[PDB]
Amino acid sequence: KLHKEPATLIKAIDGDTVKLMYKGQPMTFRLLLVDTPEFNEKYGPEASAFTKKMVENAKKKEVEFDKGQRTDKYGRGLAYIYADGKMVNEALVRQGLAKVAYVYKGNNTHEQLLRKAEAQAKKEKLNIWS
Numbered sequence: 157k158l159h160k161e162p163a164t165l166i167k168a169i170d171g172d173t174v175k176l177m178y179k180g181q182p183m184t185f186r187l188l189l190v191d192t193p194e195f196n197e198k199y200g201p202e203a204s205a206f207t208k209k210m211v212e213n214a215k216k217k218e219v220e221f222d223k224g225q226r227t228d229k230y231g232r233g234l235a236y237i238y239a240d241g242k243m244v245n246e247a248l249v250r251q252g253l254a255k256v257a258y259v260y261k262g263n264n265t266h267e268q269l270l271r272k273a274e275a276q277a278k279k280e281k282l283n284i285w286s
């Protein structure tokens with residue numbers, strides 16, 4: 157309750173940040189509840205590429221704010237991002253390309269969903285968990 161919103165993509169940045177045109181400012185958005193490696197750390201180039209293609213290839217790009225703060229202290233948007241109905245945040249965790257991270261109580265609606273995904277990635281020893 158939680159609603160999605162069309163997202164306009166300027167460019168993918170790395171595993172867990174993307175640049176959107178949001179009411180027609182260029183704005184970095186940071187993915188809620190996850191942490192990908194930096195572009196120059198192990199699985200960093202893979203996380204970047206996964207997010208990039210996932211959002212680029214989607215006909216329908218959406219942003220969904222949580223119930224709490226919509227920007228962080230750095231002025232980045234904080235959201236879940238969906239590509240043709242699939243959550244990027246979740247897909248990264250499921251593939252072992254992001255850890256569940258930065259879980260704040262104002263903004264934690266999809267926590268249990270991402271922890272389930274993380275547990276599957278862990279069990280499978282996938283990427284980060286290898």
Ligand SMILES: Cc1cn([C@H]2C[C@H](OP(=O)(O)O)[C@@H](COP(=O)(O)O)O2)c(=O)[nH]c1=O
Binds near residue numbers: 188190228258
């Ligand atoms: C994901 C997320 C990060 N942050 C902050 C925490 C970290 O701040 P500090 O810089 O003070 O440690 C930083 C991590 O982002 P990155 O993982 O993009 O570097 O962004 C939030 O404030 N809210 C959030 O929802």
Ligand SMILES: [Ca+2]
Binds near residue numbers: 172191
């Ligand atoms: Ca990161």
